[PDB]
Amino acid sequence: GITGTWYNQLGSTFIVTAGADGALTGTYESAVGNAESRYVLTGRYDSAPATDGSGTALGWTVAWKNNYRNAHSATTWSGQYVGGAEARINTQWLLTSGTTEANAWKSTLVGHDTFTKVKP
Amino acid sequence: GITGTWYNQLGSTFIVTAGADGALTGTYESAVGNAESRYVLTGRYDSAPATDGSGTALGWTVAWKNNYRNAHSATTWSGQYVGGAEARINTQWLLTSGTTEANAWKSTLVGHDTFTKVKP
Amino acid sequence: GITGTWYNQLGSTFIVTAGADGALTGTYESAVGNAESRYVLTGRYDSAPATDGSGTALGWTVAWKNNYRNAHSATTWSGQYVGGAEARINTQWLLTSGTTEANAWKSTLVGHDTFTKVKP
Amino acid sequence: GITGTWYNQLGSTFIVTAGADGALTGTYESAVGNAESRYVLTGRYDSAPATDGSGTALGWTVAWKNNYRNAHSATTWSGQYVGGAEARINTQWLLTSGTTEANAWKSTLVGHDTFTKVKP
Ligand SMILES: CNS(=O)(=O)c1cccc(-c2cc3c(=O)[nH]ccc3o2)c1
Ligand SMILES: CNS(=O)(=O)c1cccc(-c2cc3c(=O)[nH]ccc3o2)c1
Ligand SMILES: CNS(=O)(=O)c1cccc(-c2cc3c(=O)[nH]ccc3o2)c1
Ligand SMILES: CNS(=O)(=O)c1cccc(-c2cc3c(=O)[nH]ccc3o2)c1
């Protein structure tokens, strides 16, 4: 299942609990960027996925403020959990920084992260 | 200035509380506002934004399952709140559907929503 | 319909020709209108769109090198032309910069541009 | 290093010439290897990249019409070429379909493709 400790291809650590009500909660620790130690995450998942072989849709958000640092930014991951002997969560993400209006056209980075239960 | 009701460009509504802890919690629904159109949302925002004129970074997730309906998908919105008399939340979003691996390349839609406090 | 001079919401100027073969060719520049701000574009469009009221799919690329400046980056716009009283091109775009592998996670910006044949 | 035949992670074949003028020209075969599956591509690349370990920025478009078929859609790939013994083109893509205005919110898929010089 989704609940567990996951790592992406960059070595970031995603510690998540999937609640019976569809909630995702936990912490995220980035291996990259303006980031130190753990950040709160919250999100949602489909708690009754299709039974036709499809993955389980989910998403979560981290605002990159904690007691140590504040990057004035937030990332959302949108993806699906795919069961198997090598369980994986495949995502794409949007990282939006707070900007002035003049800089808003460059406010948002996009990428893709794949998570498994092992580090790189 | 984030707490309250916001409206997008297409007759959808959300309703959010921005907690002191950086949490976003509320509901996402239709203009119609019927039970079957309402879904839980959760996310995060920067509770200590820059004071240089920059927007406030935020994001949230809705999984498209409620007690009535299940689309087996989730949307994440990543964006920034821009304050004023003409307050706005400018977002980009990712909507991932659960798929089989053969169909994964087509799992994710992208788009953009702008929210205002004024019911349109 | 596609052939012409288009302007995005930020005042960039897109001078395009839609060839009978599906080709898009032209230049992309900034409002100030200097030679040093002007770059080659190439792309493709659906030369035989549906007849059911749908828009016409298209895309183009600008690499941000000209005889004066090189940003070691490229933008692609993907979207559709919507004909009628006031014709419009609605796009989303990806801007990739050359990075080292360690920085590749932050190589790509995403946004959305709308074009009309009038200035904003 | 860009000119040649490339293969993505899903069996498509990207046949490209990188011109001295920054042009990308070629064919994309969504298949192995029939005429009905071949489409024109055009795009642009940084013809004077850095030699500091950074990738070479680039992008291209396919409109999914040929003499046999027409999906009324176009993909743009935005990314970077990374040279060396294990050369890659790492991309993110946007696939826009022509839609009605009512369906425009769901016009654009996003994903990622990695291309190699050896068949996967
Ligand atoms: C906003 N400034 S920053 O330097 O770019 C920044 C700050 C904090 C964290 C991230 C970060 C981690 C992280 C990850 O693990 N996968 C994808 C995206 C990504 O972004 C990026
Ligand atoms: C009444 N709910 S619904 O029709 O079943 C449904 C199902 C899946 C998705 C969306 C939906 C809305 C919505 C939006 O307002 N911005 C971005 C994405 C997005 O997706 C709505
Ligand atoms: C790293 N290259 S760059 O400095 O970011 C650069 C240089 C010149 C022009 C643009 C540019 C214009 C432009 C636009 O009109 N719509 C979307 C994206 C976009 O990018 C970007
Ligand atoms: C709406 N058009 S379509 O039916 O979905 C269609 C038809 C033929 C080929 C593709 C296609 C291949 C392909 C690829 O290799 N990477 C990225 C996107 C992408 O799209 C898409």
Read off the CATH number of the domain in which C82 is found: 2.40.128.30
Nearest alpha carbon, ligand 2 atom 5: B71
In whole angstroms, give the CA distance from residue D47 to residue D26.
17
Task: Tokens 């176009």: give the residue.
Answer: D74
Q: Which residues contact B88 (CB under 8 A, 6 or more apart)?
A: B81, B82, B114, B115, B116
Domain of residue C11, residue span? 1-120
Q: How many domains does chain D have?
A: 1
Which tokens is B78 given? 């990543």
Pocket flag, ligand 4, residue D13 (CB < 6 Å): no
Give the method of determination: X-ray
Which tokens is A106 given? 């460059």
Nearest alpha carbon, ligand 3 atom 3: C71
Asked whether the beta carbons of C91 and C114 are under 8 A apart, the reply is yes
The DSSP secondary-structure symbol of B91 reads E
Strands B88-97 and B108-116: antiparallel
The pair phi, psi for residue A67, each rounded to 5°, is: -75, -10
Nearest CB to D108; choose among C21, C61, C92: C92
State whether the Cα torsion C70-C73-C78-C84 is positive or negative.
negative
What are the distances in angstroms from CA A109 to CA B94, C95, D47? 13, 9, 24
Asked whether the beta carbons of B65 and A95 are under 8 A apart, the reply is no
Atom in ligand 2 nearest the alpha carbon of residue B69: 5
User: Which three-class secondary structure state does DSSP give residue A20?
Assistant: coil
Which among A89, C102, C16, C65 is positioned nearest to D61, based on CA atoms?
A: C16
Which tokens is A93 given? 């993400």
Which among D96, D91, D94, D69 is positioned nearest to D81, based on CA atoms?
A: D91
Which tokens is C65 given? 């090198």
In whole angstroms, give the CA distance from residue C116 to residue C83.
11
Pocket flag, ligand 3, residue C37 (CB < 6 Å): no
Q: Which contiguous run of DSSP H or E holds residue D39? A: strand D38-45
Q: What 3 state SS string does C61-95 have? A: EEEEECCCCEEEEEEEEEEEEECCCCCEEEEEEEE
Which among A26, A97, A37, A25 is positioned nearest to A67, based on CA atoms?
A: A37
CA atoms within 13 A on the CB side of A120: 9
In whole angstroms, give the CA distance from residue A46 to residue B107.
15
Asked whether the beta carbons of A107 and B80 are under 8 A apart, the reply is yes
Q: Which residues of A touch C108 (CB under 8 A)?
A: 109-111
In whole angstroms, give the CA distance from residue B45 to residue B21.
9
**Type of residue found at A38:** R
Which among A49, A48, A8, A52 is positioned nearest to A30, based on CA atoms?
A: A8
In whole angstroms, give the CA distance from residue D19 to residue D22.
6
3-state percent breakdown (helix, strand, coil) of chain B, nearest 5: 10, 55, 35
Query: Quick one: which ligand is closest to B104's CA?
Result: 4
Helix residue ranges per DSSP H, chain C:
none
DSSP letter string over B25-53? EEEEEESS--GGG-EEEEEEE-SS--SSS
